[PDB]
Write an enzyme that holds these catalytic residues in place. Structure first.
Site, mmCIF file in Angstrom:
data_model
loop_
_atom_site.group_PDB
_atom_site.id
_atom_site.type_symbol
_atom_site.label_atom_id
_atom_site.label_comp_id
_atom_site.label_asym_id
_atom_site.label_seq_id
_atom_site.Cartn_x
_atom_site.Cartn_y
_atom_site.Cartn_z
ATOM 1 N N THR A 1 0.888 -1.246 -0.224
ATOM 2 C CA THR A 1 0.110 0.001 0.130
ATOM 3 C C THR A 1 1.062 1.237 0.068
ATOM 4 O OG1 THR A 1 -1.821 -0.837 0.949
ATOM 5 C CG2 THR A 1 -1.730 1.387 1.291
ATOM 6 N N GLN B 1 -3.449 -7.854 -5.982
ATOM 7 C CA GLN B 1 -4.187 -8.330 -4.264
ATOM 8 C C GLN B 1 -5.343 -7.482 -4.346
ATOM 9 O OE1 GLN B 1 -2.960 -6.863 -0.506
ATOM 10 N NE2 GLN B 1 -2.292 -8.697 -0.158
ATOM 11 N N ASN C 1 -3.423 -10.022 7.929
ATOM 12 C CA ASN C 1 -3.056 -8.963 8.200
ATOM 13 C C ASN C 1 -4.365 -8.342 8.914
ATOM 14 O OD1 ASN C 1 -0.575 -9.341 7.453
ATOM 15 N ND2 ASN C 1 -0.645 -8.408 5.639
ATOM 16 N N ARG D 1 -3.171 -15.198 0.701
ATOM 17 C CA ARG D 1 -2.244 -14.697 1.658
ATOM 18 C C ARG D 1 -2.845 -14.759 2.936
ATOM 19 N NH1 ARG D 1 1.289 -9.079 2.701
ATOM 20 N NH2 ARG D 1 3.305 -10.283 2.385
ATOM 21 N N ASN E 1 -3.521 -5.036 13.556
ATOM 22 C CA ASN E 1 -5.033 -4.900 13.250
ATOM 23 C C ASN E 1 -5.970 -5.824 14.273
ATOM 24 O OD1 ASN E 1 -5.067 -2.739 11.547
ATOM 25 N ND2 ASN E 1 -4.975 -4.024 9.733
ATOM 26 N N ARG F 1 9.489 -3.919 2.331
ATOM 27 C CA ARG F 1 10.083 -2.483 2.642
ATOM 28 C C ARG F 1 11.371 -2.274 1.844
ATOM 29 N NH1 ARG F 1 9.165 -2.915 8.991
ATOM 30 N NH2 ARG F 1 9.208 -5.042 8.350
ATOM 31 N N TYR G 1 3.456 6.639 2.292
ATOM 32 C CA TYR G 1 1.770 7.065 2.117
ATOM 33 C C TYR G 1 1.666 8.251 1.534
ATOM 34 C CZ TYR G 1 1.632 2.908 4.972
ATOM 35 O OH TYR G 1 1.751 1.822 5.619
HETATM 36 C C1 FMN Z 1 4.088 0.682 3.624
HETATM 37 C C2 FMN Z 1 3.768 -0.866 3.473
HETATM 38 C C3 FMN Z 1 2.546 -1.381 2.905
HETATM 39 C C4 FMN Z 1 1.881 -2.551 2.929
HETATM 40 N N1 FMN Z 1 0.822 -2.804 2.271
HETATM 41 C C5 FMN Z 1 0.374 -4.061 2.223
HETATM 42 C C6 FMN Z 1 -0.920 -4.463 1.397
HETATM 43 O O1 FMN Z 1 -1.465 -3.543 0.616
HETATM 44 N N2 FMN Z 1 -1.157 -5.770 1.271
HETATM 45 C C7 FMN Z 1 -0.478 -6.535 2.114
HETATM 46 O O2 FMN Z 1 -0.943 -7.970 2.130
HETATM 47 N N3 FMN Z 1 0.489 -6.422 2.959
HETATM 48 C C8 FMN Z 1 1.027 -5.120 2.919
HETATM 49 N N4 FMN Z 1 2.137 -4.735 3.765
HETATM 50 C C9 FMN Z 1 2.977 -5.745 4.466
HETATM 51 C C10 FMN Z 1 3.787 -6.331 3.623
HETATM 52 O O3 FMN Z 1 3.693 -7.032 2.280
HETATM 53 C C11 FMN Z 1 5.070 -7.257 4.207
HETATM 54 O O4 FMN Z 1 4.312 -8.422 4.570
HETATM 55 C C12 FMN Z 1 5.723 -6.686 5.374
HETATM 56 O O5 FMN Z 1 6.123 -5.384 5.106
HETATM 57 C C13 FMN Z 1 7.122 -7.334 5.874
HETATM 58 O O6 FMN Z 1 7.819 -7.712 4.898
HETATM 59 P P1 FMN Z 1 9.096 -6.933 4.856
HETATM 60 O O7 FMN Z 1 9.870 -7.008 6.066
HETATM 61 O O8 FMN Z 1 9.968 -7.495 3.810
HETATM 62 O O9 FMN Z 1 8.764 -5.231 4.642
HETATM 63 C C14 FMN Z 1 2.564 -3.530 3.531
HETATM 64 C C15 FMN Z 1 4.020 -3.338 4.279
HETATM 65 C C16 FMN Z 1 4.233 -1.964 4.358
HETATM 66 C C17 FMN Z 1 5.475 -1.517 5.249
HETATM 67 N N1 NCA Z 2 0.213 -5.749 6.130
HETATM 68 C C1 NCA Z 2 -0.752 -5.109 5.335
HETATM 69 O O1 NCA Z 2 -1.799 -5.912 4.865
HETATM 70 C C2 NCA Z 2 -0.799 -3.605 5.135
HETATM 71 C C3 NCA Z 2 -1.787 -3.119 4.175
HETATM 72 C C4 NCA Z 2 -1.799 -1.836 4.278
HETATM 73 C C5 NCA Z 2 -0.747 -0.997 4.760
HETATM 74 N N2 NCA Z 2 -0.163 -1.530 5.687
HETATM 75 C C6 NCA Z 2 -0.129 -2.880 6.124
#
Ligand code: FMN
Ligand code: NCA
Length: 397
Positions: A37, A114, A194, A243, A251, A348, A375
């Site tokens: 996101t 997604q 999530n 997922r 949440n 990230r 964001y």
């Molecule tokens: C800014 C941000 C936006 C994210 N948006 C989504 C999302 O739209 N849908 C989702 O399933 N996970 C979302 N996530 C969770 C990530 O897909 C991922 O599971 C999480 O960041 C952990 O992986 P990482 O350590 O490599 O960042 C988001 C995470 C971050 C930080």
């Molecule tokens: N972990 C997530 O699904 C998520 C979605 C949107 C923003 N941040 C996290």
């Protein structure tokens, strides 16, 4: 700048850089861009960003044969509540998504939408503005006190879904999935993780229902599996992934503190494998790791050490994407991709490294991410993160 203190390891010699088939797609490597996101969609109408989104995704698609899963994308107005997240229910949305997928396909990479529904994580006042309900599994439980108060102040209290509401959500998923594929997507991922709406039905903390959608493991899984079955039927199982985040607490989900939580997710996976043995195997299961129970916390914080996702491998026999704090831990990746059906999602650090795959391959330094532009409605922190060679020119080394 580059991340300070990070000692990169080249992963070129590992299964991370072995090709693998996922659904209809042929990947060249197993580093996945997971759903992120970014809130660059415009209001009104939740329209994908016409200036920057195709560029952003094209940048991260640059290594041929890369798998990209889009940001959470709303299946309908009622599924949403975030003004600057995209939807894919309308012609105007689809029109821009076409350009975004074109940018990804131009790199000979792949795009999975997604499909997102918020439930109690939505904003009740924004929903009220649009004449929409504030949806949840059980109105007896709220996600937190802030949203509960916002709900009261908006005169838009939580609404426990009726069976008919659930049927309409399933119709919305179908419609959004058909639009996704017609727009050019290679597949969709059902977001059931999530703490968003489907996860709220899975979780016994949010789901206090006593109808056929709650009260047992089987009942709590019903909504998610109905969505899975509806999409299998309409766009094919090889165009559908799912997922899940067994250990998530984001949440207000239960996570490992609920000793029944692994039986809940085991049941879901067993039901998926049952479908697979009958000839309808999902393209993949995408698991968030206990390495990240809450992505609002910095890497290394919120790590649950008393359970693993190993159970999933004994049940589900297809591809598994794993995500959570892997970029800073190539030593962990090196061990986990020894399993031949494991892929790794990098969230990230894909935000901050458009050429992440190259950096992983060659063991290069990683760009630090800037949380303050995760964001914002800006190109800054979206499309202006440098490739490695660009960073070296800016003196980052
Ligand atoms: C800014 C941000 C936006 C994210 N948006 C989504 C999302 O739209 N849908 C989702 O399933 N996970 C979302 N996530 C969770 C990530 O897909 C991922 O599971 C999480 O960041 C952990 O992986 P990482 O350590 O490599 O960042 C988001 C995470 C971050 C930080
Ligand atoms: N972990 C997530 O699904 C998520 C979605 C949107 C923003 N941040 C996290």
């Amino acid at each position: 700048p580059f991340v300070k203190g990070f000692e990169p390891i080249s992963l070129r010699d590992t299964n991370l850089f072995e090709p693998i088939k996922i659904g209809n797609t042929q990947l060249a490597h197993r580093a996945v861009m997971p759903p992120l996101t970014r809130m660059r969609a415009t209001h009104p109408g939740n329209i994908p960003n016409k200036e920057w989104a195709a560029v952003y995704y094209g940048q991260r698609a640059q290594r041929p044969g890369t798998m990209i899963i889009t940001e959470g994308t709303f299946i309908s107005p009622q599924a949403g509540g975030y003004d600057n997240a995209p939807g894919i229910w309308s012609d105007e949305q689809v029109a821009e998504w076409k350009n975004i997928f074109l940018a990804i396909h131009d790199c000979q990479s792949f795009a999975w939408v997604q499909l997102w529904s918020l439930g109690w994580a939505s904003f009740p006042d924004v929903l009220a503005r649009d004449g929409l309900r504030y949806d949840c599994a059980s109105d007896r439980v709220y996600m937190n006190a802030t949203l509960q108060e916002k709900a009261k102040d908006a005169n838009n209290l939580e609404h426990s879904l009726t069976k008919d509401d659930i049927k309409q959500y399933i119709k919305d998923y179908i419609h959004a999935a058909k639009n996704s594929i017609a727009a050019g997507a290679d597949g969709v991922e059902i977001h059931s993780a999530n703490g968003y709406l489907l996860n709220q039905f899975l979780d016994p903390h949010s789901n206090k229902r006593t109808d056929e959608y709650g009260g047992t493991i089987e009942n709590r899984a019903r909504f998610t599996l109905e969505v899975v079955d509806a999409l299998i039927e309409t766009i094919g199982p090889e165009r559908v992934g799912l997922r899940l985040s067994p250990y998530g607490t984001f949440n207000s989900m239960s996570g490992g503190a609920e000793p029944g939580i692994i039986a809940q997710y085991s049941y879901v996976l067993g039901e998926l494998e049952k479908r697979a043995k009958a000839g309808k195997r999902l393209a993949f299961v995408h698991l968030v790791e206990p390495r990240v129970t809450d992505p609002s916390l910095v890497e290394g914080e919120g790590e649950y050490s008393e359970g693993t996702n190993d159970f999933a491998y004994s049940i589900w026999k297809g591809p598994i994407i794993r995500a959570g704090n892997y970029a800073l831990h190539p030593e962990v990746v090196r061990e986990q991709v020894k399993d031949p059906r494991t892929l790794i999602g990098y969230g990230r650090f894909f935000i901050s490294n458009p050429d992440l795959v190259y950096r992983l391959e060659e063991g290069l330094p990683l760009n630090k991410y800037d949380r303050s532009t995760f964001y914002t409605m800006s190109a800054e922190g979206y499309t202006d993160y440098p490739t490695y060679e660009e960073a070296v020119d800016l003196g980052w080394n």
